[PDB]
């Protein structure tokens, strides 16, 4: 790994998209043992309130990466960025098809209070074909002329990740919701550990996997 | 007028983009008996909570406009938005460029709780010619494969509304953030309304320009 780029425990991060209090702090704390990041969405903040964040690094000390595929103009951007490094989230998910400045408004934040925004590239669910995966390689380039560190890519398909690196570099920290850790520095894993009967366990056995 | 589309009164809509609740509702309540829908952004909703938006209509009657810009893979679309509507907005504003399932996603929520949703076909801010601006009117003529009867187009550019009419009709709801109202069925203000010293009073007054 590199120095300059954030330390994923494990390279495994869990992607809480339960929409419950309860059940998203009983999954969580149960794998802080194996993971140290976590990421959230809007389906669990919007119903639960953004002071979920701070409570997830308060009661388990675990890095949060905002999904919030921040997509407005500048402003809205800053307002939106600030706001949730304000509620505690180390990191934030941008999208890149709204143009360079919409990601400099969010690098800006990210900058004066001494958090990370990570830049998504492309998506992989079936209508990211019409508009997505046509932009993903200029998205990415772009990431690159903002300075951009960090990236969120696809991960069904390995020669996109190839093709991503050769884009970004092989410096940059790259994520993907085996060979797919060849290219990305960690992967985000949802369903297979949040429905698990003891999430600790299987947590446990796909970290084994990596091994 | 067309009677299967939301009646805005005056035609004017108010973007409240303040992040304070005490300065959010004291601008909208000033401008009640002027505008009767209201649209909020993640910058108020994530800085104060959801239950803002139960407040604004429980406290003022005022049709809720959630711009969330929906723009994430269909099942967490769909999550949002039930969410978001069940937070009592009335509308959601949805990003276009990720494709129709991630549309369609939305609208079936919206149609189960008879809410609606809002088409984001175009962006105005500076980097929206990158990748915006040449999808736009492939995003529209989506939208009207999808049934879509309300879209937020631009505004700075006359000409663009014209072209978005030409694709989507005259019948479908169009808002935009004198000529506009030839095209468009309701105006978005913001700084014009909630930064004036008597937002009342610039209510009134752009509203005696419309008529």
Do not use: W
């Amino acid at each position: 790994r590199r120095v300059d780029v954030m330390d994923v425990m494990n390279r495994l991060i869990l992607a809480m998209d339960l929409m419950n209090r309860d059940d998203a702090l009983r999954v969580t704390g149960e794998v802080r043992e194996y993971i140290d990041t976590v990421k959230i969405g809007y389906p669990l903040v919007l119903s639960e309130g953004m002071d979920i964040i701070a409570e997830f690094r308060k009661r388990f000390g675990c890095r949060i990466i905002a999904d919030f595929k921040v997509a407005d103009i500048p402003e809205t951007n800053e307002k939106i960025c600030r706001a949730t490094f304000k509620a505690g989230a180390d990191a934030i998910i941008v999208h890149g098809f709204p143009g360079a400045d919409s990601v400099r408004a969010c690098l800006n934040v990210a900058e004066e209070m001494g958090r990370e925004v990570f830049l998504l590239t492309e998506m992989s669910h079936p209508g990211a074909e019409m508009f997505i995966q046509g932009a993903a390689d200029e998205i990415a380039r772009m990431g690159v002329d903002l300075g951009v560190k960090n990236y969120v890519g696809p991960s069904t398909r390995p020669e996109r990740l190839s093709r991503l690196r050769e884009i970004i570099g092989q410096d940059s920290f790259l994520i993907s919701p085996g060979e797919t850790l060849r290219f990305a520095d960690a992967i985000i894993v949802g369903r297979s550990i949040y429905l698990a009967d003891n999430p600790a366990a299987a947590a446990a056995g796909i970290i084994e996997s990596i091994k």
